[PDB]
Amino acid sequence: KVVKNKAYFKRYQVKYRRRREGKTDYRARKALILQDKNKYNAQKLRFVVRKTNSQVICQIACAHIEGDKILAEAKSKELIRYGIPVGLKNYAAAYATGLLCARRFLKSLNLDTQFLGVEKVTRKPIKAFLDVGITRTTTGNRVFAALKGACDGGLNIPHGNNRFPGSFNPEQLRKNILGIHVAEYMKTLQEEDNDKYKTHFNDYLKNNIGADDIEQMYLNAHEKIRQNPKKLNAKLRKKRVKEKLALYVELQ
């Protein structure tokens, strides 16, 4: 039979618009939202990170019945203002992006001077919870870098070490947030071939950042950021049908 029967439309129940679109999980969201119900006005602030192809977006979110309120929000293309012009999709960039969001949030609260957090790379603070945001929580994913930046900033988001590189290497994490592997790949590609090196990291070449310089630039920026955060109608359609019908009768 024809599967796209009238009956098939008629029975159908759609899944929720955001799930249908594919942005949200819902199962994760419902679990994430709920606080223990005898607690009152504890709103369980989520640190939401979504990784768009261009750039990673970090927001502080609070669930309410007429929809989520965002308190602080940062996008990777702000790092340009802080001296990083390039690499805005990168892991390094994501660590920076997270950190920027946390500092701006604290500044808004006026608790920037209350907690200056972790200096460089190795009362109780305000608390938040990392969002998965539909990407797999596979080891070395970008969200964990963002989480680390937030944490190093000042926010307390409980975490394991498991999904940083290796099953633990803190030195590798330090290299990675600095960007040392990206530089290594640049050196490696240049050694391999000059055409491939220039064609690939073309924007980097234009801006004029040597591989060696990337860590310095990111470090300088990182230090700077911590210091200083039309429709028709029925009568009309009726007409349109009449006109179309007359023309169709003549035409063929």
Partner: protein, 155 residues
């Protein structure tokens, strides 16, 4: 013969057409304070905290709250006597009631109206109207617009 836990619940606990699928996320946010009134409406997208048949469609005061549980004082008719029963349910089935809200709204509206009236020393019947008989009135009907009727013949 048998009378087990979900006995005779077929159509009652089943969802309406196009209303299958998990409890909406928003629904966990709703506020419950002690002594708030609360309906007990069964679901079946959740299995834990499902209440026995009788407390479907009943409504009572919240007396106790846990991590996801809510204690509800419900009246039950047992032969010659109502007695109070503490039904522990989970949040998915407990729904914030509206019956209370009518009275609460009335209090707010009354308070404002009373304050203004009393300030002017204008005596006032704040209590509910409770629809009286229809008062007398004078009505213009055009003598050309009136229609006259008869019962129809049979066919």
């Amino acid at each position: 013969k048998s009378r087990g836990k979900r006995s005779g619940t077929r159509y009652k606990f089943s969802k309406k057409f196009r209303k299958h699928g998990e409890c909406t996320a928003n629904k966990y946010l709703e506020k419950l304070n002690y002594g708030d009134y609360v309906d007990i409406v069964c679901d079946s997208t959740q299995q834990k905290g499902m209440p026995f048949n009788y407390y479907h469609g009943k409504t009572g005061k919240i007396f106790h709250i846990t991590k996801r549980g809510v204690g509800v004082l419900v009246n039950k008719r047992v032969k010659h006597r109502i007695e109070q029963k503490k039904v522990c349910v989970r949040i998915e089935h407990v729904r914030k009631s509206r019956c209370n809200e009518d009275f609460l709204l009335r209090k707010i509206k009354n308070a404002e109206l009373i304050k203004e009236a009393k300030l002017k020393n204008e005596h006032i019947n704040i209590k509910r109207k409770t629809e009286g008989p229809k008062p007398a009135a004078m009505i213009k009907v055009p003598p050309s617009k009136i229609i006259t009727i008869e019962p129809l013949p049979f066919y």
